[PDB]
């Protein structure tokens, strides 16, 4: 429920660049500044003789919201010999994958091709650039001497990437060994220290990699997607990967041990061509030490009320347990051909309630098919199966589908308010957008009447007017409010009260406030955040037997409270929100 939808920040790249195809935050240790990283894999660059080389842009959060390229490489193609190019950087898709961790940025070109040291082939090995600080290096584990389709020549290394808690890269290459696919993992210190610009097939000593297998595993695409998390309890992150063509095209997810690359677990799809493993994520959703596995199947078909198959898409949620089992639940999409589950993004704890939350995209859903992101909350029982917010794309096709939500990143607080934000990519319109999480207020409200029962008998109100004594009742109300993170210490609530609230057709009211001589009261009330309940009290009274006949129905007291959001807004204009289970009104009753 918590993202600011009315004032999000837009960023745009060049027309047709695919700006927004990959997104991440950049949070250097060296300074207080933070940035968005955006990949634009079809962008033109100043590199000599290169067409659509792709680039990564570093985009500022405040004030001017400038984007500028990162200079990972300014060179054209290297030469193996005179008029014999070593490599082919045109159309390489650089920035199709982007990640960062502290000062480290890793970005990749899955469609980079090279001419082997042995023969004039043109093989899509893929390549990555790692920037460690002031220093940039090339990492290309598939540019090995294993040079054919039966080896690593078609690897496309860096088609997906991630960083572990300890400094290792995990890298996927879906094309190795006749498209069986491969995972590789290297230590970041080993990548940076073994780099040499004169050696094209560098060997790293601490490398972990998956091996070639029997021909029945060909065309499986291991490494099409990757994520990391601990799945055997030793504190080292294990490697999770989507294998979307495995098991006769049901699709699979494989988990490998992060210290030795042996297999821990397999998950399998239940429908062919559903693409189970297009996206994977790992995060603790239910508040344990144990991380839980999220698997997207964007093309999954369920059966409608008429029994017809319809292409809604699905996510599978697998809660880890201490026994080594998983408890599995399935979550279907809401609209036909929307491709629900195309991207999955751990948000961290989005509303600070104690359980982590997740965003799931449907990039071809919504009105005009502009794309939707659905937000789901964690609970002690698992994921809450009902989405608590919907984010919607706001640009027309112009002319490919906008694809809003095809890439996402959460779990970083960019403006330091205490709540983690979300970046959404919309690469079909060359655009990326930042949604900021609002501060959440929990309100406790009290309403009380002292005499729960009266018989027009306790005639004791002297009344500021006529001399006759009137039957009183004391009525009182209270508020307290608080929230985690950054928000103003004083909050203004409009508090509003009604007497006889159920009979309000313009019919005669029998209960009135003593000083007002009316059935209603309104009060601008300022309260300070914390445990101290703040209260006010009024005298009200019941009218004479001459004035009304209905002695049978209860007198109902009703209270509403509204926060002055425009006064509680921070210096950036971000307004807080009331916690979604807060009842905006409360009632009491008395009998006569």
């Amino acid at each position: 429920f918590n993202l600011d939808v009315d004032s999000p920040a837009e960023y745009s790249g060049p027309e047709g660049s695919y700006f927004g195809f990959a997104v991440d935050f950049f949070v250097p240790s060296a300074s207080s500044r933070m940035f968005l990283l955006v990949g634009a894999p079809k962008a033109n660059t100043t590199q000599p003789g290169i067409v659509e080389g792709g680039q990564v842009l570093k985009c500022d959060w405040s004030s001017t919201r400038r984007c500028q390229p990162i200079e990972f490489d300014a060179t054209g193609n290297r030469d193996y010999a005179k008029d014999d190019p070593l490599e082919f950087k045109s159309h390489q898709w650089f920035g199709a994958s982007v990640r960062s961790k502290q000062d480290k940025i890793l970005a990749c070109a899955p469609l980079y091709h090279w001419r082997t040291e042995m023969k004039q082939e043109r093989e899509p090995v893929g390549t990555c650039f790692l920037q460690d600080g002031t220093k940039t290096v090339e990492y290309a584990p598939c540019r090995s001497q294993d040079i054919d389709a039966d080896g690593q020549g078609f690897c496309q290394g860096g088609f997906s990437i991630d960083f572990t808690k300890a400094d290792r890269v995990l890298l996927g290459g879906p094309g190795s060994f006749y498209w069986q696919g491969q995972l590789i993992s290297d230590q970041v210190a080993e990548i940076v220290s073994k780099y040499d610009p004169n050696v094209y097939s560098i060997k790293y000593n601490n490398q972990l990699a998956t091996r070639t297998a029997q021909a029945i595993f060909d065309d499986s695409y291991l490494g099409y997607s990757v994520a990391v998390g601990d799945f055997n309890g030793d504190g080292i992150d294990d490697f999770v990967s989507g294998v979307p063509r495995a098991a006769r095209t049901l699709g699979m997810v494989y988990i490998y041990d992060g210290k030795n690359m042996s297999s821990l677990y397999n998950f399998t799809g239940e429908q062919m061509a559903a693409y189970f493993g297009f996206s994977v994520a790992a995060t603790d959703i239910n508040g344990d030490d144990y991380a839980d596995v999220f698997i997207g199947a964007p093309l999954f078909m369920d059966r409608g009320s008429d029994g017809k198959l319809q292409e809604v898409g699905q996510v599978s949620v697998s809660l880890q347990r201490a026994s080594g089992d998983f408890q599995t639940t399935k979550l279907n999409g809401f609209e036909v051909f929307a491709r629900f589950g195309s991207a999955i993004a751990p948000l961290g704890d989005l509303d600070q309630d104690g359980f982590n939350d997740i965003a799931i995209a449907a990039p071809y859903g919504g009105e005009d098919k502009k794309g939707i992101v659905y937000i789901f909350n964690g609970r002690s029982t698992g994921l809450n199966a009902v989405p608590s917010q919907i984010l919607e794309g706001q640009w027309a096709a112009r002319s490919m589908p906008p694809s809003f939500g095809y890439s996402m990143k959460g779990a970083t607080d960019i403006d330091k308010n205490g709540y983690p934000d979300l970046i959404v990519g919309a690469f079909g319109v060359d655009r990326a957008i930042l949604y900021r999480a609002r501060p959440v207020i929990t309100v406790n409200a009290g309403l009380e009447v002292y005499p729960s029962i009266l018989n027009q008998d306790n005639k004791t109100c002297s009344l500021p007017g006529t001399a006759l004594k009137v039957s009183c009742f004391n009525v009182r109300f209270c508020l307290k409010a608080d929230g985690k993170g950054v928000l103003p210490r004083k909050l203004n609530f409009q508090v509003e009260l009604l007497l006889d609230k159920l009979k309000q057709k313009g019919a005669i009211r029998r209960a009135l406030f003593l000083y007002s001589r009316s059935p209603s009261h309104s009060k601008n009330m300022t309260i300070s955040r914390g445990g101290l309940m703040q209260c006010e009290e009024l005298i009200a009274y019941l009218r004479d037997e001459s004035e009304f006949r209905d002695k049978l129905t209860p007198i109902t007291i009703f209270m509403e409270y509204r926060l002055d959001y425009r006064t509680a807004a921070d210096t950036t204009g971000l307004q807080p929100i009331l916690n979604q289970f807060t009842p905006a009104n409360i009632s009491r009753q008395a009998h006569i």
């Binding site: 078609f154 065309d219 006769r248 061509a273 036909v336 005669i508 209905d550």
Partner: protein, 479 residues
């Protein structure tokens, strides 16, 4: 009963209580009798017959042409579904039933489009089918007077992971390292438009040759889509059975596989075959998903036949289980049996009837009891199996409405799979009484202009209560 025990607040509310309820709309009814009741109780209380305002459901056939005995000659007059149009009346919770009857008419026209994998292993096949047209017309003469045959071919998207791109000779001849000649790679090409000049199939097939590609999966679904949606290019008739015969010896690429080529635009299901008969979007747009193929195969009434070799039969069986109106047959490793494969598959395509439903409103639902053979019944089933060409089958359908719909009229279509013969249902909702045409707000009679006009009894605006609106509602009073 339910009608008298709910509030008698208006004729419109009374009809919304239950399908059994009726309403007396004139002053002859004795006061204190509930105005909403079963119609016989309104007659016991001497309500006038024209006053009782009781709509009852009906299902009237507006167009009801008899089923044909022959598919030959009569063309647009051939009829395979018995009621063609029906008017159906409903009220806010009611159900009504009607019968549809369907025939697999014999000697009906047939269009066969032959869609061929031309990867390098298919040379034995391409040599074997070079006289298939005159053999196919000789066997199909038993089954149809009016055959048309056409041809098209596929390999896969001509892009880096799938096609040879070095040395430069391999762009012009993908077979150069095999020391032989084959064509440059192509995604899909149309070759022969559907024609009854059967010798054109033999002429055009003799001019084809194979190409070559890197990985084992083939781009065949990208070709099934274009062979479906390019109507005037392929030449599909309105009045025919459509058979799309898909041949391959290999597994296939599927939606989201194109991301390895840098292709990320979803398949739009439009026609992109140009003046050169090649599929122009092949390098820029992703492969179809099974749901998009299923939609277009249904929209165009095509029956798909997977004619595939033993090494992949189970794969295409498990895809056939996800697509309606579809079947599989075991192709020989040289296509030498493909003639009997088409003739037997056409039998398996006519041994069923199954019903589609289209445009059905969210307020409606349907249920089906199928008669099939020997005047049996199968309850809850939209289908029959084990039939023959010339068989007739019946279904009884019941439609129910949930509440009153906000639009008074709508329509939906019931149709067999693979045919354009259909039953069109027009629905009308009787949520309203006829007396509401004589209503008036702040009317005469009643009390001091506080009554909306009666339809049977005065209805108050705010502040008032009673059968002539004669008491204030602000608290209870005898006056």
């Amino acid at each position: 009963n339910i009608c008298t025990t709910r509030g008698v607040s208006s004729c419109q509310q009374c009809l919304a209580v239950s399908p059994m309820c009726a309403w007396c709309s004139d002053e002859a009814l004795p006061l204190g009798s509930p105005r909403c009741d079963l119609k016989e109780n309104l007659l016991k209380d001497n309500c006038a017959p024209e006053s009782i305002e009781f709509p009852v459901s009906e299902a009237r056939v507006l167009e009801d042409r008899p089923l044909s005995d022959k598919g030959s000659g009569d063309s647009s007059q051939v009829t395979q579904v018995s009621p063609q149009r029906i008017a159906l009346r409903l009220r806010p919770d009611d159900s009504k039933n009607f019968s549809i009857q369907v025939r697999q008419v014999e000697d009906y026209p047939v269009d066969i489009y032959y869609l061929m994998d031309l990867s390098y292993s298919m040379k034995d096949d391409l040599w074997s089918i070079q006289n298939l047209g005159t053999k196919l017309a000789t066997q199909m003469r038993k089954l149809t007077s009016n055959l048309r045959i056409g041809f098209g071919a596929f390999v896969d998207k001509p892009v880096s992971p799938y096609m040879y791109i070095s040395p430069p000779e391999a762009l012009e001849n993908p077979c150069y390292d095999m020391k032989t000649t084959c064509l440059p790679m192509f995604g899909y090409k149309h070759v022969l438009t559907l024609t009854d000049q059967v010798t054109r199939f033999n002429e055009e097939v003799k001019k084809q040759s194979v190409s070559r590609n890197r990985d084992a999966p083939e781009g065949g679904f990208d070709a099934i889509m274009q062979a479906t949606v390019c109507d005037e290019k392929i030449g599909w008739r309105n009045d025919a059975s459509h058979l799309l015969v898909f041949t391959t010896d290999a597994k296939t690429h599927i939606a989201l596989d194109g991301r390895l080529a840098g292709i990320v635009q979803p398949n739009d299901g439009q026609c992109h075959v140009g003046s050169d008969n090649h599929y122009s979007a092949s390098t820029t747009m992703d492969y179809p998903s099974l749901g998009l193929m299923t939609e277009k195969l249904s929209q165009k009434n095509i029956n798909l036949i997977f004619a595939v070799t033993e090494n992949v039969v189970n794969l295409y069986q498990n895809y056939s289980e996800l697509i309606p109106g579809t079947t599989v047959g075991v192709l020989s490793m040289d296509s030498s049996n493909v003639l009997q494969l088409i003739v037997d598959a056409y039998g398996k395509i006519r041994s069923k009837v199954e019903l589609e439903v289209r445009d059905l409103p969210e307020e409606l639902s349907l249920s089906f009891n199928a008669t099939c053979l020997n005047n049996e019944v199968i309850p809850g089933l939209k289908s029959c199996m084990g039939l023959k060409i010339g068989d007739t089958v019946s279904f009884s359908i019941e439609a129910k409405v949930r509440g009153c719909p906000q639009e008074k009229e709508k329509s939906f279509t019931i149709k067999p799979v693979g045919f354009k013969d259909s039953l069109i249902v027009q629905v009308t909702f009787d949520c309203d009484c006829a007396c509401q045409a004589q209503a008036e707000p702040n009317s005469h009679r009643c009390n001091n202009g506080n009554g909306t006009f009666e339809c049977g009894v005065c209805r108050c605006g705010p502040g008032w209560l009673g059968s002539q609106c004669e008491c204030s509602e602000e608290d209870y009073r005898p006056s």
